[PDB]
Design a protein around this ligand. Structure first.
Ligand SMILES: NC(=O)C[C@H]1NC(=O)C2(CCCCC2)NC(=O)[C@H](CC(=O)O)[C@@H](c2ccc(C(C(=O)O)C(=O)O)cc2)/C=C/C[C@@H](Cc2cccc3ccccc23)CNC1=O
Ligand SMILES: NC(=O)C[C@H]1NC(=O)C2(CCCCC2)NC(=O)[C@H](CC(=O)O)[C@@H](c2ccc(C(C(=O)O)C(=O)O)cc2)/C=C/C[C@@H](Cc2cccc3ccccc23)CNC1=O
Length: 93
């Protein structure tokens, strides 16, 4: 879509997002090294972060595997992330 900028090099992607107002300004581009792969470049305060768009064996896309080592970690995550897939819900007594 409109966030998609195809073969824009990494450098010029950072050049571009660097001249943008707010944090979280982004685009997706083809990976510099990996044929058929995508990179997400995101303006965040003073730098540009680059993420590799991961794929699994079924061909789905993700940035990271969301799993936790404890119940505590799971609870702290979902105090700012919704527990529900279709409703916004957080946290408690
Ligand atoms: N989605 C993610 O990128 C979560 C990851 N990254 C991080 O935590 C980050 C998050 C932003 C703040 C800095 C640290 N980033 C990084 O580690 C890196 C850091 C970087 O910017 O060099 C990130 C990255 C590497 C290279 C590119 C590059 C390309 O595709 O050739 C490009 O510009 O097109 C883009 C991004 C990816 C590493 C891959 C990852 C290892 C890896 C996984 C799967 C496939 C390959 C394939 C080839 C090499 C490495 C990997 C580790 N990094 C992470 O998993
Ligand atoms: N982009 C979205 O937000 C859409 C969905 N995803 C979610 O709600 C999510 C992600 C956002 C945060 C809440 C959990 N994910 C999921 O629901 C899930 C599953 C879940 O329990 O978290 C998502 C999913 C299933 C399977 C894999 C698996 C594989 O594909 O073989 C793998 O590991 O790669 C991965 C993911 C199921 C989708 C079916 C969906 C039901 C469905 C819709 C349309 C067509 C079909 C067709 C067949 C079965 C189900 C559906 C429900 N999930 C969503 O609709």
């Amino acid at each position: 879509h409109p966030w998609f900028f195809g073969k824009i090099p990494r450098a010029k992607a950072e050049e571009m997002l660097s001249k943008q107002r707010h944090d979280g300004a982004f685009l997706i581009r083809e990976s510099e090294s990996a044929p058929g792969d995508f990179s997400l470049s995101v303006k965040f305060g003073n730098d540009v972060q680059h993420f590799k768009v991961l794929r699994d064996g079924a061909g789905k896309y993700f940035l990271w595997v969301v799993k936790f080592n404890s119940l505590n970690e799971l609870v702290d995550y979902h105090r700012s992330t919704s527990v529900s897939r279709n409703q916004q819900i957080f946290l408690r007594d």
